[PDB]
Design a binder for this molecule. Structure first.
Ligand SMILES: O=C1C[C@@H](c2ccc(O)cc2)Oc2cc(O)cc(O)c21
Ligand SMILES: [Cl-]
Length: 215
């Protein structure tokens, strides 16, 4: 439209939709915040993906009431806030837009090993998690992730992880994989929102969104 107000959200120029329906779901989630995942390799700051976090705004707000009135800065500096967010028993979705093309096995292998190690550090790695991580890794082995492809990670509840990939950025229609393991599902969300997050900018953006939502 050239005549009515339009809203656009961008992460370094990359558009994110302000709302999304998870693959295979029927309900609509709103963008809480989004950021870039950068990697410093041999002193070069490479942008590799953009990450958007979605949930039902009023619903997630109702599960974060103690944080009401906190500014974005106060939330971003508080590990307890992000732990509440990761644990909140509400539907969540993370949309990843691939910036640097990569093989699925490389993306999935790196993430799987990080989850393995992070779970081990917390003493939350047992045979159940090992098995779930094999399922996770094997899903990504079947995919290619060229520039512009999208990954949808969907948590219909905190113990269930659904995954879908689109190589053209399109939104899939049912989940391609379902991994039933509470610890792996939570650990993946924590890769984005927890300590030693891969994207401080995503965390900061989500803190801004939630701070505003709560007020
Ligand atoms: O460089 C990597 C490897 C990978 C990764 C590296 C370290 C780590 O701890 C976890 C994952 O993430 C990526 C994602 C991309 O779209 C493109 C990339 O080139 C990369
Ligand atoms: Cl990522």
């Amino acid at each position: 439209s050239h005549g009515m107000a339009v809203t656009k959200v961008t992460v370094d120029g990359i558009e994110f939709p302000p709302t999304i329906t998870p693959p295979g779901s029927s309900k609509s989630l709103t963008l809480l915040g989004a950021g870039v995942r950068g990697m410093e390799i041999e002193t070069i700051q490479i942008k590799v993906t953009a990450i958007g976090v979605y949930a039902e705004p009023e619903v997630i707000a109702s599960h974060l009431q103690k944080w009401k009135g906190k500014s974005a800065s106060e939330l971003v500096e508080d590990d307890g806030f992000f732990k509440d967010l990761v644990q909140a028993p509400v539907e969540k979705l993370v949309k990843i837009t691939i910036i640097k093309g990569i093989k699925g096995s490389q993306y999935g292998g790196a993430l799987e090993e990080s989850i393995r190690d992070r779970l081990a550090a917390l003493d939350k790695y047992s045979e159940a998690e090992e098995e779930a991580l094999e399922e996770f890794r094997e899903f990504f082995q079947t995919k290619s992730l060229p520039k512009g492809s999208v990954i949808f990670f969907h948590w219909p509840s905190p113990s269930t992880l659904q995954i879908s990939v689109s190589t053209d950025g399109s939104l899939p229609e049912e989940a391609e994989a379902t991994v039933e393991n509470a610890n792996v599902a939570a650990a993946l969300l924590d890769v984005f929102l927890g300590e030693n997050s891969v994207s401080p900018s995503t965390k900061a953006s989500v803190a801004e969104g939630i701070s505003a939502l709560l007020m």
